[PDB]
Design a binder for these strands. Sequence first.
RNA 1: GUAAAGCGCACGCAGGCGGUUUGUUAAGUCAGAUGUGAAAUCCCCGGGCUCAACCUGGGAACUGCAUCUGAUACUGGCAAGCUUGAGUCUCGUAGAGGGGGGUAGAAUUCCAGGUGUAGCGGUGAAAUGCGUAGAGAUCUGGAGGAAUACCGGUGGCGAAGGCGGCCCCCUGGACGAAGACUGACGCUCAGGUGCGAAAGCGUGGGGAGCAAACAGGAUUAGAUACCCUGGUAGUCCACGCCGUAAACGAUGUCGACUUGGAGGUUGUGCCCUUGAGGCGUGGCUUCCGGAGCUAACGCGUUAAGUCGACCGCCUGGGGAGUAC
Lengths: 129, 218, 88
Amino acid sequence: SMQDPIADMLTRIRNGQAANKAAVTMPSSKLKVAIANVLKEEGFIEDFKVEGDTKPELELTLKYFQGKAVVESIQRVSRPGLRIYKRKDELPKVMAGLGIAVVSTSKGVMTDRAARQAGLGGEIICYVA
Amino acid sequence: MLKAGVHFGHQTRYWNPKMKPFIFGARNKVHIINLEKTVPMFNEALAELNKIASRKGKILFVGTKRAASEAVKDAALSCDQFFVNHRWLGGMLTNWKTVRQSIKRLKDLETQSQDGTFDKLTKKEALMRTRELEKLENSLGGIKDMGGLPDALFVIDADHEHIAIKEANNLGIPVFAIVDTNSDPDGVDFVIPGNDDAIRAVTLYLGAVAATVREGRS
Amino acid sequence: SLSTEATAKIVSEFGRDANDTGSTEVQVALLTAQINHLQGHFAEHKKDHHSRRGLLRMVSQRRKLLDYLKRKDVARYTRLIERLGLRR
RNA sequence: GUAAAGCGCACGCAGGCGGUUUGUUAAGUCAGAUGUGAAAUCCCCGGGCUCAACCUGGGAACUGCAUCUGAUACUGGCAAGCUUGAGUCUCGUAGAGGGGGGUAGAAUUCCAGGUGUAGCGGUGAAAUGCGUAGAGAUCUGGAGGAAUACCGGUGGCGAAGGCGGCCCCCUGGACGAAGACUGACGCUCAGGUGCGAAAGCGUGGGGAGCAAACAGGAUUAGAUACCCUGGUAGUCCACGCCGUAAACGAUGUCGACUUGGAGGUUGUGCCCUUGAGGCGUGGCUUCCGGAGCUAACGCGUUAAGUCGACCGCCUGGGGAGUAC
Ligand SMILES: [Mg+2]
Ligand SMILES: [Mg+2]
Ligand SMILES: [Mg+2]
Ligand SMILES: [Mg+2]
Ligand SMILES: [Mg+2]
Ligand SMILES: [Mg+2]
Ligand SMILES: [Mg+2]
Ligand SMILES: [Mg+2]
Ligand SMILES: [Mg+2]
């Protein structure tokens, strides 16, 4: 059963880009959306939206570029049953900077560089390069 | 794209999830080539041919299928435009270096029968050499006057001329095919979804494209 | 499975009101029925292993059901047990 | 998957993991600070022995443990709900699913008798064997045991093993439909529990056919075999024991995404239903196959593709699944 909702979003995305699928959908939620917002304000997807009233949806429109899809590498990190929490100076550097690492800080779902510069640690989430 | 009302779609239900973004409908089982998105590529893609076509663009036409074949000659021969309507050879493009050897032969042998130079030898060895042209000209004909890889290329339907397409892109030759439903477009950089045959669909775009290729040279 | 009559009947007796089979307490009782009854069918034959599966399955389900009740409302839990003479 | 390696299969305690919204907390988590983290090593910058080894000044490091102050996104505690997960109900759906009891017809063998006469049976040939004490064949009556031709299939059901005539009785599960209801009650699971083909073991029954053993006969150089003529255990039954299999998809379970084509199976919505006809849309199941994966063979929306939760197992071959 859905023991890890986060992964699904990530998995759903990578699979889409590989399937040339326009966008993607899924039952949104606090974190789900917040995470997507990072992918948006960074450059990995066209945009995103939360449809439905009682039942949350998610119009996570995947983005593409030239003769290839945007997201070329996106995996989980702080997976369940093996949560990973790191400090400010203990934050990884996805693809030497070219990529990004979505991290959950006490301030919000920031990015490696972001939270890092702010001066605070946080639970990683993925290495969407 | 008004004339497009003379070819519509084709192929029952075999198609290919790759040509899906180009299907108007599927009435009476058989799909329907989305003529609406075919128009944009009709010209845009066609216009590009005129480009290189301007400088004696060696536009090589392809199509061995019954209908096309007999017609390919006319449309292409309308000018420098080369063509091949008798089953593509294995390497006539990539292995041009070795394939050409037949071209030279066909040429010299062609002249043999041309002027007073073929008449001689026993009917056996005499008529034997006739056979050669009876075939060499069948495939080497629409290329014998070609001096190396064509400036570009243009085939009727890729799904059948697969071999041709491969040799092209393998050498780095642009591809313009009119593949329909049951056809892999990924092998063509300029796809033109349209009936792979149809008495009109063939002759139509044939001379239609030949225009900007023969009439399009300044 | 269970007698339509006895089924609906046993429901109203524990239902939070009426026509609420899904009700927690309800499930237990309704389940305990075929449970306490199958005993006979099983007492006889005995080698009806395949049928045992259904029993053992629904049996374990009762537990997994009661534990819940005791977790989200110690009240109802301690009650139902009584009316059903459960817990040893 | 085939190289070493998916427990034969289930149920499930501990354990691990936990859909969703808000509030609350602030334990994990992050930050700041204060302790403590001996010195010497190590490291960087710098000195002193002609240099170097060496000695040394300072700092960094000491990944750590604790206390205090906060931060609240995430995990967790709590309270309150939510409904998509799971389950309950109603209604149908098909079925070699299970236990018990009946029961029919086809054939086999055997017994009795009628008819009839010199063969039958068997093989590659034979031979043993059965026949004049009358076989075989044929007809009539009867005794009994085991198994259900046809339907029947790429079929169906089941956790696995496995399960086919028909009839009833007791009984479990799976599926669709509209909805009505409970409200995360879930997934997985070491140990544990239970189910386990065949052969085998115990007690007591039953015994037609087949058949280890055994006995002849033939084959052969030999033939403790294959082949022939007989034939015991057993096979069948009841209750108990034994737990193994190439217990095989040689592929653990649960959940989510990822182009297609062809066909079987059963449920359901709709169409002059005017038709079996057509369209959809669920569960299951074969075949081909793309992407991708693969050492290749191959797998391919029923994955061995792309991910997540949990478990089992592998670490060269022989010795050895042997000894103790
Ligand atoms: Mg082996
Ligand atoms: Mg192995
Ligand atoms: Mg297995
Ligand atoms: Mg020290
Ligand atoms: Mg919380
Ligand atoms: Mg046995
Ligand atoms: Mg025995
Ligand atoms: Mg099945
Ligand atoms: Mg395949």
